[PDB]
Ligand binder design. Structure first.
Ligand code: HEC
Ligand code: HEC
Lengths: 125, 125
């Protein structure tokens, strides 16, 4: 869907910005600093689930740029592993949010965050 | 969810960028220049539906900036009308995509585009 590589960069950066907002806005809730409304978090995680599937299609062949390391493309299987692991952890977060269980939400949220950090370390400049 | 007004600006700009990609990538399909796969478009419109609900919460009080005209805030009822009309047209696009009807998709897509343009004219610098 991208006329030039730059367009893919702009898309993924926006997707990741949104993803990050929908994840990080739950921090005060998982820490207990903000109240836990199970329905609010369920709805928010549903949005996060949608967003978290979006960035990966915008790292297609030839879309090198932004802060993406070139190893995303030359190690495609390893990058794909990190993104599928992250998405699998999003599935676990969805299950916790759907269950309305603050303890499971906290644990699942920590797993997601670690998946973000792991891909960041390997694949972001 | 925004620590500073700038954060809201960055969020809405990213949401609108994504929204725009998910809408505009269907242009060649509605024009017949790309093939029409009803399931592909149904799935894409589902993503667009999610995205199209997101920007409005990031124009909260005191989040003036970006290319947002200040009239968004001083004419809140009029801005809200444009966004709800746009979202209602997204509902019509969803129905067309769910029905797998290229004719209805084309018409619904044109209505959505006109809603984008109308808000742009009134509320974007
Ligand atoms: C690889 C499988 C990743 C996972 C999982 C996550 N992110 Fe990431 N992120 C990744 C890359 C390669 C990049 C750079 C993209 C580019 O072309 O510049 C990023 C970038 C971000 C950004 C900045 C986006 C911007 O506005 O420029 C943010 C804020 C970000 N990533 C956040 C983030 C979070 C919160 C994640 C889990 C919820 C997450 N990322 C996962 C690669 C990967
Ligand atoms: C009001 C109810 C709007 C509707 C409906 C749409 N858009 Fe819009 N858009 C609006 C504003 C006020 C702004 C400026 C936001 C800011 O703070 O700068 C925008 C901006 C865009 C952008 C640019 C985003 C960026 O990266 O800076 C795009 C690409 C855009 N809008 C596209 C677009 C499309 C395709 C719409 C319908 C599918 C659409 N907008 C609707 C206000 C409104």
């Amino acid at each position: 869907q991208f006329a030039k590589p730059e367009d893919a960069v702009k898309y993924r950066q926006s997707a990741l910005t949104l993803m990050a907002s929908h994840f990080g806005r739950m921090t005060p809730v998982v820490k207990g600093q903000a109240p836990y409304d199970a329905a609010q978090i369920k709805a928010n995680v549903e949005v996060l689930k949608t967003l978290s599937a979006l960035p990966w299609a915008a790292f297609g062949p030839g879309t090198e740029g932004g802060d993406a390391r070139p190893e995303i493309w030359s190690d495609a299987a390893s990058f794909k592993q990190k993104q599928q692991a992250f998405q699998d952890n999003i599935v676990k977060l969805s299950a916790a949010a759907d269950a309305g269980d603050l303890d499971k939400l906290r644990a699942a949220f920590g797993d997601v965050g670690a998946s973000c950090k792991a891909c960041h370390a390997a694949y972001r400049k």
